[PDB]
């Protein structure tokens, strides 16, 4: 299918991005192309953040540290595949995405499934659980059936 072929090409672009980055930094155009637009056969994990120094968002800073550990653990995993990717959207680069999602703070972790829209449990319950990488990994396994076993140096 034309669509199947274009999907395959899209996935190859994400795999090329993976050779240079563990986490894809997105603006609104990239978010829409790779996360909102069909076709997809992969899950996307997104950290919505605000890391600019002038904002001094302490929680975003700590959560990014744990997200980095998680995405590194994925990169080195025997589980690594083209069926799951990690992204981030910073408020100051993707303000339009935050507006579309009705978000006026950070951070938030979401899973965007390949088919359909996020379900209730596709927003990580940060305010209950905290954001240890191991807890993010447990949530990802619950939502995607991908098991990332976190490594720490």
């Amino acid at each position: 299918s034309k669509k199947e072929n274009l999907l395959a090409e899209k996935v190859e672009q994400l795999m090329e991005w993976s050779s240079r980055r563990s986490i894809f930094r997105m603006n609104g155009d990239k978010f829409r192309k790779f996360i909102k637009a069909p076709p997809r056969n992969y899950s996307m994990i997104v950290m919505f953040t605000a890391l600019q120094p002038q904002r001094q968002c302490s929680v975003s800073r700590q959560a990014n540290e744990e997200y980095q550990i998680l995405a590194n653990s994925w990169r080195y995993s025997s589980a690594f595949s083209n069926k799951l990717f990690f992204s981030m959207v910073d408020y100051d680069e993707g303000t339009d995405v935050f507006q579309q999602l009705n978000m006026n703070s950070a951070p938030t972790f979401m899973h965007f499934p390949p088919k359909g829209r996020p379900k209730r449990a596709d927003t990580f319950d940060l305010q209950r659980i905290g954001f240890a990488a191991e807890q993010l990994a447990k949530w990802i396994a619950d939502r995607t059936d991908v098991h990332i076993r976190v490594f720490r140096l």
Binding site: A50, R55, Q56, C57, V59, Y91, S105
Partner: peptide, 6 residues
Amino acid sequence: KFHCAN
């Protein structure tokens, strides 16, 4: 409006 702790 956007807000974050510290």
